[PDB]
């Protein structure tokens, strides 16, 4: 049993016709102090998987080292390490889910909420969640923390059920994700303007975008607001 010290906020994600998108901001909070401003919370594994992590940053850095070791280990005595026997998103998730549930069962959890986003060998989209309790679930859209309450409602308007996925392009999906990040910046006190975004597509592969900013913000209407009654 512990308490989280340095923490990261929401991770948000969704499926579209040819793949998946995932995003998270670059802040490391120390309670209400916005202490660290250059923290990368999306960690790519190969060219087919991106793992997005919220919660305790010390535990995130540990998980990052576990994934790095997983890639090293998979390559051992494996001639097809960059082909048929490469790490799949499904393999990476199941491993993390096993670790998370084992750690909660020893009453010593990794204080995180994790979303694994990727594309499988057969082109199928992969998107699944796991947290400090070992709880897992899948959905056309997934989000952690504040994102669950504010991003999901917006992302579900684009893809409401499974049959909406083939009708959703990458342009429409990215647009929806970027808007959700703006909404979170307006309303989450532990969020930042700077964020990272990753697209995993079955045709164009992994596109990793750093140093993105929330833009097109509405503040002008504040000038007319006076007093409290």
């Amino acid at each position: 049993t512990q308490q989280p010290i340095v923490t990261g906020t929401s991770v948000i994600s969704m499926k579209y016709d040819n793949g998946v998108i995932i995003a998270a901001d670059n802040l490391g909070s120390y309670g209400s102090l916005l202490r660290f401003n250059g923290v990368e919370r999306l960690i790519p594994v190969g060219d087919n998987t991106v793992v997005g992590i919220s919660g305790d940053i010390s535990d995130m850095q540990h998980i990052e080292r576990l994934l790095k070791d997983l890639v090293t280990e998979n390559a051992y005595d494996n001639p097809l390490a960059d082909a048929e026997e490469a790490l799949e998103p499904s393999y990476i998730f199941e491993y993390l889910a096993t670790v998370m549930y084992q750690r909660r069962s020893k009453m010593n959890p990794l204080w995180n909420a994790i979303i694994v986003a990727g594309v499988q060998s057969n082109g199928d989209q992969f998107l699944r969640y796991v947290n400090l309790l070992g709880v897992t679930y899948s959905s056309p859209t997934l989000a952690t923390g504040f994102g669950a309450h504010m991003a999901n409602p917006l992302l579900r308007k684009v893809v409401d059920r499974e049959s909406d996925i083939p009708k959703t392009t990458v342009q429409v999906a990215e647009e929806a994700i970027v808007n959700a990040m703006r909404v979170l910046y307006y309303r989450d006190a532990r969020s930042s303007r700077n964020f990272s975004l990753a697209i995993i597509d079955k045709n164009t592969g992994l596109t990793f975008k750093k140093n993105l900013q929330v833009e097109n913000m509405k503040w002008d209407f504040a000038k007319d607001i006076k007093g409290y009654g």
């Binding site: 340095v6 120390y30 010390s58």
Partner: protein, 196 residues
């Protein structure tokens, strides 16, 4: 406690106050909080004095044994050893450590390890109870690639303000300069920094 480390053109400088308190009593007014774990790898300690002394002694041992086998360790390696002790024993430790060092290949580097045992590489770092009062000042006044004299002034002015507002900080301002030229100790007394 008020501690900081700042990278500059020729390397890195560590800074600290000298006050150690038991409640409101000053148990030591001339404490040395800048501790050597290797020739040109030092650290600033905050939190439990017992914990940070224990950790620093273990790190000094680890780096002494590393040096005998593999030669001079990098600052990153020293930070990693600090992290391993802080992360794995997070339930039983209260330690906030800043690691600073000079390589010839990497030059001046600063790593901060907060309570949870995470690591963060930064151009400069501030920690301790007094640091809260100088987040604004340090963010506005820090520049990359400053001179030795400019960096001494930046730290002197920063810790002066931390001491002024934080009751748990005070005494003399100690500094350790890490460059290719060697290791230099500096000390600044109240009559100097209080009039800044």
């Amino acid at each position: 406690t008020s501690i900081m480390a700042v990278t500059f053109k020729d390397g890195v400088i560590l800074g600290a106050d000298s006050r150690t308190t038991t409640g409101a009593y000053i148990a030591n007014r001339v404490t040395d909080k800048l501790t050597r774990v290797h020739d040109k790898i030092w650290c600033c300690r905050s939190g439990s004095a017992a914990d940070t002394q224990a950790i620093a002694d273990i790190v000094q041992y680890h780096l002494e044994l590393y040096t005998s086998q593999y030669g001079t360790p990098s600052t990153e390696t020293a930070a990693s050893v600090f992290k391993e002790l802080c992360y794995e024993n997070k339930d039983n430790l209260t330690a906030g450590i800043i690691v600073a060092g000079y390589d010839d290949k990497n030059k001046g580097e600063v790593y901060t390890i907060p309570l949870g045992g995470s690591v963060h590489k930064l151009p400069y770092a501030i920690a301790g109870s007094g640091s809260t009062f100088i987040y604004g000042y340090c963010d506005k006044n820090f520049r990359e690639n400053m001179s030795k004299e400019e960096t001494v002034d930046f730290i002197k002015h920063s810790l002066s303000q931390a001491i002024k507002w934080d009751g748990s900080s005070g005494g003399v301002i100690r500094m350790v300069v890490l460059t290719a030229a060697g290791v230099e100790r500096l000390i600044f007394y109240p009559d100097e920094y209080e009039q800044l």
